[PDB]
């Protein structure tokens, strides 16, 4: 059956009798089990390269074949997992060796055996049913938050032979026996699929919602949609944490997943520790993100292939609790680190280097990943919607975006949230250059906002022109100071201000801005550019007049208003209903109506 | 005659690195024939014989490499090349790279079989392109004017609403019938609906053809796509008189499927990676164009292209620079400022405008007000790049009408509705109040006679 | 003596300017470009080698 | 008969060249002249007017016979040649003629089989010194020798023989030197006496628009004779695009004493003519840092007839019916009117600079706008409406015009 | 004289022998017949493609721009077949010429030969653009035996200083006709005018010769000081004060 090693040269190892493999056929090399991919048949040879170090790898050592392409297990007990790149538990890897250590020669299951799990089969089916891939055939109970749904494997169909009843169960349980062409296939809750694959759907579908992440510059000025593409910036001096963060701790999507591309070892361990002691609220009741999560992290001395499958392991599991019926969303912490892995897998392929030293393929790649994102309508009979959303960070040198992976991930994804170090030095966080950044999903909103928010998009409109019109004012302050300004351009250059530091800026240490809800954050912004028109209107329908409006005349007779609202941010979800906030706001449209009647 | 004799299936796999597969003991292998490969799991893939020697023959597989098997694969030979089957009834279709269907209609009913590769037009049949077409662009149809078969790209910066003005042509486009062929290469879902919606919006779903690959699609199919668009193109302008436009889009997306297979190949690289031959294989889709003796079809191309880094010099916009008949520039420059749709006139040329103009095609004055506005917009960029140094006191009052030139300009001879049609007589009226705006005797690309016409108007 | 001094300043503050200018808008972006056209040229020389 | 086109058909002997090759274009003719006999390259990024020029030197020039090799060359190329030459005409002994009857094309379009570019340019050639053999002055049109190259680099990368600079043999050098050099003008083979020649014009198109390109570097070492296209000219529509500090042409020693027989006041012309045409690059280099107010008047004078020399001289819209071509007289009473304006401007301020009654550039234009406007307006004469007498008189006329208002300013 | 000529459309591989053929001529007259030899190598970038073209058939390793890695070896078993010999008169004197690629003066081809020769003479578009002929540009140019030809009894006494100096003036008219522009002409001091008045002067007159002004060794250092007289004398820093009160003062 199995193979035999015939030679090694570095990571490289040839074998022979390898007639039945195919390449990338996963394949175990040597006593010591080594995990490779088979990147060449030469008949009944094969070469395959190693992942972990080839280092007394023999001669004649056993090759045994994989059944299977570089794959994941899908399945319960992903929720709170750690894995690596390649599909190994951390965690267990961990806590099973007793060692700090990753063993060279790893064979831990991915999803732990003999760890019971409360299954229901779904009490819809009956003996001779039929099924297809993609149905709902049962749900485990795995946490409170997240009901796992099992399903059919893509692949599979046929008629039910046999289901198992209500009750406790595990990986090595036949939950589910099925029949086609009078072949049986037994089935199980552990799933697996081919990593590079994409999961098939009925039908992907055009994005029409936010992924409101609670912050205000993003939510308002750079709407990204659920199962958008879009990337950040991320580098140390401009605070990339604060955006994941709060997409895992906040936002309005059900199950996210974390990808450590290759990031700096230490870096890598802040997020591990950090992530668990991360909380929020379902129900009125206060729970760990753990519940709602699972984290792909590879150190940057993690395995060349671990790397550049890193990304890809991530999609992998974002899909399949996509198909689940969730709206899941995914981070990869530095495509530039994945990019870098496949720099170096191709180095060692001895393949030409395209741009800059990286493969031909890194623009393919790159889409065909970012590809696998959107709203879809699932596989099977339940008729259920999700979405896979991707928020990948890049880290160009020195900001330049001409850097291939830079370049390419800002061709293909549709929102850019710059993240910049001068604001962070500032303390202007959330730190998001509103000049840079931008996002491309503002039209496919347009019927969200029209039924729900239907004067917001003149207000982001309005908004974004005011705070432009400051950054072309700024100029002419440079050159002939503030004094010189018109009315109108002095007003402007308040206001947009005022926008800049108490509504794009959010503290997410205080209370009352640790969140900031959709209908806050349009309210707030209502407030502002209700006064912007009317200040404005003073001063210009007092044009040619004898006594003519100005900012200061506004400050003095009504700077209550300009207080207030900057104090607008300090409502508070919790403490304070809905109504109540809305009340307050409508009460300080009323207050600044009635005080600019006392001047125009 | 029809190939009669029966097909061979090999199980012999010899070799398999990278996207090829190298077969053995192959009974007088063709060069360029199609093979199909049966993978061990029952999945069914495709594939082009690269090169041969004795036994060997060296099968790139289209769909990808990843499962093929040194015991199990089975290569069923085809015996000829990539054939495909064209009709008129694949007008108001929709297909995969590849050709297969996915509008959820049936197959193809051929008929014809075509040769994907076409075959090289006889440059003595060959008729040059010169009954012009108005986009309705002005940026187009008064300076860079396209002729019913010319070829020519639009190049654009990524993120530039190019997609949009393609949109445009695909709806403003005619004669001073008429069918479409567009192929897209490596693009987006959220981009291949857009123009499956457009053709919807502008109600010219019925006459035109959609070849669909996106970025999740196979990447080697990309460079058999724009050859079967060609192809149904050919059938329907050489064979069926159709007025046909193609538009190929991101041809940046099928230049990537190029430099991988050249990497993987290990083709001699030119500049940035793309193989030696990457002029001629942009030929090979380029040339496939123009009218053809006692032919009334006539194939238009505008292929579409995403500049990498922005960089004209790029040898994707470099080569096809060099084949196409003058190309069409997209900038941010104008699109940050907002100006729809941003073509900047000054880089833009077209080849074929020189004949495509004037008596019995355009109005008389039309060369000569183009010239006009290029050395006028162009002296306003250099004005423009003073003032940016040495302020406006350096410049005189002819350096800041120049100046003024190039502002009146953009607002109102560039910037245009995305729906809104301006015939080219309204085009040139629009250069005119522009050319006014300096004195009659200024105008030193324009002769007496057409200032005496059409000046002081 | 305010007026020498406006006089001589509203000169040399134009005359500074515009050689601020001119390395702003000349001499770096040449400078870059050069840059950048070398670090492609070094490449193309490397993928040959 | 039948000749192996790689083989050099032989000749008596290979004389120095000594005769202008005749070209539509003013630039050319005037600035860097062609030689029948002599080889040349077009270096030129896309879209730089390469093949008009190309183009140009086919329809109007005083070839006996041209060879066209379209190398590589977009197919609507040949069907505009095979559309346009039987209806240009030229005149022989009182019988106008389809300059087609003077022509032949070696056509291999871009998408024909690579191989056949290599063919194709031998082709050319072997026809050229057919021709040649004849006593015929013939032209040929290398249409693109690095199209050319590019087949070359395909042929060697299946062979898998190692490479030179960007993928091309390391032949390549060699291979280009052996074609041009095939140029000449000869003592035929035989008995009767012949004078025959063929000049070679290669179109040249390098990779990304730059001059580092092999094809260019190996080309530039071999022929007499570089027209460098700018694009930056192109872009402005600015045509034929040659840039003037770039280009050069070997054969002005050889050509001089034919420019001493018939057109004595050439030489100082076309000198004065190429010393404006730098200075005013020299003078560029400085406004760029300071502004224009930094200019005397001497250097206002040498921007604005550069001014003249660019955009009335060396410009040329070659489609239109008085660009189509343009006759020595024409080229050199142009030339002898602006640089008659440069000289008589130039005299009057180093005439009255030495006063407080000094001249300046500025009074010259508010006293000599007419002028300034006659001058750009010497283009538009047209041979087939105006004899070489009346160009040659209107001419005339604005010399006294110039003469008699310099003559009120001093 | 004696002229190997291989053109253009002669066939590549004998341009290797060309050379060495001409050389071993030369060897021959000098050093069996006494004879002073001049070689002139007509364009050694020629003979070194001829390496490159059967090197690559030869799928030999590359050093730089895909030329043979012997090509240093090679170039020197030619340019070194030179100067006199024990017990004879004869000597060959060789001025190898060499199309720089590309104008690049870094290009292997002159790289490797300015590492053999004994400095070179470099003509520069630059000089040729401006219409000074010969465009000899003396900056890059060197010279390494010079040092020995000159002093009393080989020259006039003065030769090696007034070149110092002259070199010096050149080099620095380069730097101030760059300030011209970087800083303004009105920037530069009278002393910077000055050495751009000599940069002017040194390659209207020292420089420029025209094609049959056989000027003498004595001749060129009259032309030497009356471009150095230019400068006040405490300027000429690279000149001993003993030179100067004896050629200054003229
Ligand atoms: N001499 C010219 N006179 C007028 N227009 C020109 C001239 N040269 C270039 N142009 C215009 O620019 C186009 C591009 O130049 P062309 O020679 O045809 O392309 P290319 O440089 O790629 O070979 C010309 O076809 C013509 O339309």
Redesign the pocket.
């Known amino acids: 059956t199995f193979g035999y090693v015939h030679g090694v040269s570095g990571p490289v190892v040839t074998a022979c009798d390898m007639a039945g493999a195919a390449m990338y056929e996963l394949v175990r090399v040597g006593h010591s089990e080594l995990v490779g991919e088979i990147i060449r048949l030469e008949g009944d040879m094969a070469t395959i390269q190693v992942y972990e170090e080839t280092s007394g790898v023999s001669v004649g050592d056993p090759v045994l074949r994989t059944g299977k392409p570089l794959s994941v297990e899908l399945g319960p007990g992903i929720m709170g997992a750690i894995f690596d790149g390649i599909q190994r538990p951390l965690s267990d890897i961990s806590s099973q060796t007793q060692s700090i250590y990753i063993p060279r020669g790893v064979n831990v299951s991915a999803l732990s055996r003999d760890i019971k799990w409360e299954f229901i089969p779904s009490k819809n089916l009956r003996v001779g049913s039929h099924i297809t891939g993609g149905d709902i055939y049962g749900i485990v109970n795995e946490n409170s938050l997240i009901k796992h749904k099992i399903m059919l494997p893509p692949r599979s169909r046929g008629s039910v032979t046999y289901i198992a009843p209500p009750g406790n169960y595990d990986a090595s349980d036949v939950v589910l026996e099925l029949e086609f062409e009078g072949v049986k296939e037994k089935l199980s809750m552990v799933q697996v699929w081919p990593v590079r694959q994409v999961r098939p759907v009925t039908e992907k579908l055009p994005a029409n919602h936010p992924l409101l992440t609670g912050q205000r510059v993003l939510d308002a000025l750079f709407p990204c949609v659920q199962g958008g593409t879009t990337a950040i910036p991320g580098a140390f001096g401009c605070g990339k944490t604060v955006i994941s963060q709060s997409l895992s701790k906040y936002s309005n999507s059900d199950v996210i997943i974390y990808v450590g591309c290759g990031e700096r070892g230490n870096e890598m361990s802040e997020v591990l520790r950090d992530f668990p002691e991360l909380t929020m609220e379902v129900d009125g009741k206060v729970e760990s993100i753990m519940k709602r999560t699972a984290l792909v992290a590879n150190t940057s001395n993690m395995p060349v292939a671990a790397r550049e499958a890193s990304i890809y392991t991530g999609i992998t599991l974002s899909e399949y609790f996509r198909d689940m019926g969730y709206h899941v969303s995914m981070m990869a912490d530095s495509t530039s680190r994945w990019a870098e892995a496949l720099r170096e897998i191709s180095g060692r392929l001895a393949e030409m280097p395209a741009d800059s030293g990286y493969p031909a393929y890194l623009g393919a790649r790159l889409a065909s990943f970012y590809e696998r994102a959107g709203r879809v309508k699932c596989l099977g009979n339940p008729e259920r919607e999700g979405s896979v959303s991707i928020v990948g960070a890049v880290s160009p040198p020195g900001g330049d975006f001409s850097d291939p992976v830079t370049s390419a991930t800002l061709g293909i994804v549709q929102v850019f949230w710059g993240l910049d170090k001068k604001l962070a030095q500032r303390k202007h966080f959330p730190s998001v250059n509103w000049l840079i950044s931008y996002s491309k999903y503002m039209r496919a909103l347009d019927e969200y906002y029209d039924k729900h928010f239907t004067e917001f998009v003149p207000l982001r409109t309005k908004a974004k022109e005011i705070l432009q019109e400051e950054e072309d004012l700024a100029e002419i302050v440079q050159l002939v100071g503030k004094a010189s300004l018109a009315e109108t351009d002095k007003i402007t250059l308040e206001v947009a201000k005022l926008i800049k530091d108490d509504f794009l800026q959010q503290n997410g240490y205080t209370p009352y801005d640790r969140f900031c809800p959709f209908y806050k954050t349009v309210g707030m912004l209502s407030n502002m550019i209700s006064f912007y028109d009317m200040a404005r209107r003073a001063v210009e329908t007092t044009a040619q007049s004898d006594n003519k409006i100005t900012w200061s005349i506004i400050r003095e007779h009504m700077g209550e208003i300009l207080y207030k609202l900057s104090s607008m941010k300090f409502k508070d979800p919790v403490k304070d209903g809905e109504a109540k906030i809305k009340a307050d706001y409508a009460q300080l449209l009323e207050d600044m109506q009635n005080a600019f009647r006392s001047l125009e | 005659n029809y190939l009669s004799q029966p097909r061979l299936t090999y199980k012999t796999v010899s070799g398999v690195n990278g996207p090829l597969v190298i077969l053995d003991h192959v009974k007088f292998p063709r060069y360029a024939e199609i093979v199909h490969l049966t993978l061990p799991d029952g999945t069914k893939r495709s594939g082009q014989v690269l090169e041969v020697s004795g036994s060997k023959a060296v099968v790139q597989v289209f769909e990808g490499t990843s499962g093929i098997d040194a015991k199990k694969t089975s290569c069923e030979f085809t015996g000829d090349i990539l054939r495909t089957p064209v009709s008129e009834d694949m007008l108001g279709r929709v297909f995969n790279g590849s050709g297969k269907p996915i509008d959820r209609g049936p197959v193809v009913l051929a008929e014809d079989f075509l040769d994907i590769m076409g075959q090289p037009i006889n440059p003595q049949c060959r008729i040059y392109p010169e009954e012009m077409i108005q986009t309705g662009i002005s940026a187009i149809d008064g300076m860079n004017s396209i002729a019913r078969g010319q070829k020519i790209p639009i190049f654009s910066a990524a993120g530039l609403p190019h997609n949009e003005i393609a949109a445009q042509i695909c709806r403003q486009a005619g004669l001073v019938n008429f069918a479409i062929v567009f192929a897209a290469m490596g693009v987006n879902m959220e981009t291949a609906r857009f123009f499956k919606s457009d053709f919807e919006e502008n109600g010219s779903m019925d006459n035109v053809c959609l070849f669909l690959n996106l970025a999740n699609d196979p990447t080697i199919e990309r460079i058999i796509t724009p050859r079967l668009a060609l192809t149904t193109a050919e059938f329907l302008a050489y064979q069926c008189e159709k007025h046909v436009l193609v538009i190929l889009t991101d041809m940046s997306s099928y230049a990537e499927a190029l430099r991988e297979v050249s990497a993987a190949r290990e083709e001699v690289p030119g500049r940035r990676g793309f193989p030696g031959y990457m002029y001629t294989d942009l030929a090979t889709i380029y040339e496939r164009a123009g009218r053809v003796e006692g032919r009334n079809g006539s194939i238009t191309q505008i292929p579409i292209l995403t500049m990498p880094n922005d960089d004209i010099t790029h040898p994707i916009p470099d080569l096809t620079?060099?084949i196409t008949?003058?190309q069409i520039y997209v900038d941010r420059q104008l699109h940050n400022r907002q100006i729809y749709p941003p073509i900047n006139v000054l880089p833009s040329?077209?080849?074929?405008?020189?004949s495509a103009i004037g008596e019995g095609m355009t109005r008389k004055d039309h060369a000569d007000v183009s010239?006009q506005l290029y050395a006028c917009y162009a002296i306003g960029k250099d004005v423009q790049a003073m003032k940016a140094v040495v302020g406006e006191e350096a410049l005189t009052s002819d350096d800041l009408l120049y100046l003024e030139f190039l502002q009146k300009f953009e607002k109102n001879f560039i910037t245009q509705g995305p729906y809104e049609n301006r015939t080219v007589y309204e085009t040139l009226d629009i250069g005119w109040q522009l050319l006014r705006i300096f004195p009659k005797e200024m105008l030193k690309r324009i002769p007496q006679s057409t200032l005496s016409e059409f000046y002081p108007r | 003596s305010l007026q020498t001094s406006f006089v001589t300043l509203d000169e040399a503050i134009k005359i500074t300017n515009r050689r601020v200018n001119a390395i702003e808008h000349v001499i770096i972006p040449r400078i870059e470009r050069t840059l950048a056209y070398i670090i492609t040229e070094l490449d193309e020389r490397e993928r040959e080698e």
């Open positions: 620079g060099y008949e003058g040329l077209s080849r074929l405008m020189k010239n």
